[PDB]
Subunit: 124 residues, 4 copies
């Protein structure tokens, strides 16, 4: 359907953070994420979920995903989740907010979690 | 290792929101989630990731997961993500913040995303 | 100083949400805020704080402010705070994230708080 | 009214973070905040707003405040805002979420803002 065909593909933000994702199986997001910033290099596994039967009446399609920042080259002892929605059109977008939590001692737990926003445009 | 054995099991918060998760395969989380609140009934697929080789000296283990609020009988047109960390011990905890986004019109996108906090405690074998 | 002169003035985001602010007295923000969206009409009181001695290493100036959405026209039983930083130069910006909490019963407290992001540019005049 | 009497006083969280606030003037919060954690020493100025005519259906009272982490002792080049609600009664609480932004260069702006929660209990009228 349109949610599957819309989300599936490659997405990039203004900083060149890029992900490749497949949307299907009635709600699964799978793919890989590459950050252009922070303690990260090369690709990280992405897993998430999306609404596979969205309100078709001008609303976006809700979705989210997770990346743990460990791969074969690096481990940043952190994970990020993005929560947002897919909007179609010529300039299709995934508009999100994100939360990045680092593993901490209990003393530093109050400062464990960064928050931000990320808008992705579809590249292929 | 300890992150896999610590995280895997059954977890619930002060409201009775509960999940069952398995941590393995070098950083995968899979399970089911049940909310006691909101436009939700019964169980929903959970998928996420965790740090499979956490810092060695008393830090928490970073993890996150996602639930889209559609299952076999309900669809709330929304998805939540939880980002947080695991800590072990007898009162093991997963301490998180969450973001819940609804599909909206572009005019209403400014009000699409709720935010909150959720501390889960692991059900012990002694239960 | 630079931070007082830079923050002081009229600011608007892409949606036409607008505020007018004065920065002074070693850290005080005072002004009015007008929202183009939501359960809001006319101008609301804004109060906040800023770092009146910011780093001079190229960093922005931290700041934050609060609006309770009650005025003489409307009461939306809610309040928003913005947390962010000011950056000067010809494309001066205040880049923020915000938290909007509504008064709720305990049963609805779990869904009391919205989050978003807001970038403001300086208006003349 | 009960919002003013309710919110005015001394509050603390589980970590010992404490603020002393006066609520009045049809929606003003004024006082000082002391953190027990982080790059903070002694008392900082607090300014905020609250809903001075809240719903009477059992709902909490929306509120928000800001602290810039500059005082006569220290400057941490950052500001925090708390958005939340006051719930009255015999276990009077202020339940909030917060956003802490540091001034940063543009290279570091992506990591400028921390997020958390804070529940406060009233320790003194
Ligand atoms: O990064 C530091 O050196 C200190 C802050 C602690 C964070 C540790 N983890 C990381 O740096 C992993 C990479 C995070 C990248 C973030 C950025 N890139 C994107 O594509 N979007 C944003 C959000 S994601 O969390
Ligand atoms: O309640 C309404 O109908 C208005 C809010 C619109 C959101 C629609 N989505 C839902 O209600 C799905 C359920 C969300 C449950 C939330 C709550 N339960 C938990 O276990 N933790 C929190 C976060 S989760 O997002
Ligand atoms: O989801 C629902 O049906 C209830 C939403 C509850 C929010 C009630 N409060 C309001 O509508 C007051 C106005 C909020 C305006 C928000 C928007 N305008 C801006 O300039 N920036 C954003 C953040 S501000 O909180
Ligand atoms: O890496 C680090 O050292 C932390 C990031 C830089 C933050 C600098 N600012 C500060 O440390 C000022 C103090 C923040 C205190 C926070 C804590 N205390 C409370 O009462 N509640 C929380 C939120 S508040 O922002």
């Amino acid at each position: 359907g349109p949610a599957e065909a819309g989300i599936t593909g490659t997405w990039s933000d203004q900083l060149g953070d890029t992900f490749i994702v497949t949307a299907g199986a009635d709600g699964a997001l799978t793919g890989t994420y590459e950050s252009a910033v922070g303690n990260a290099e090369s690709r990280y596994v992405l897993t998430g979920r999306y609404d596979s039967a969205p309100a078709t009446d001008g609303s976006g399609t809700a979705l989210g995903w997770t990346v743990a920042w460990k791969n074969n080259s690096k481990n940043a002892h952190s994970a990020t989740t993005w929560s947002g929605q897919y909007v179609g059109g010529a300039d299709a977008k995934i508009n999100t907010q994100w939360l990045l939590t680092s593993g901490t001692t209990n003393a530093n737990a109050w400062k464990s979690t960064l928050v931000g926003h990320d808008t992705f445009t579809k590249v292929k």
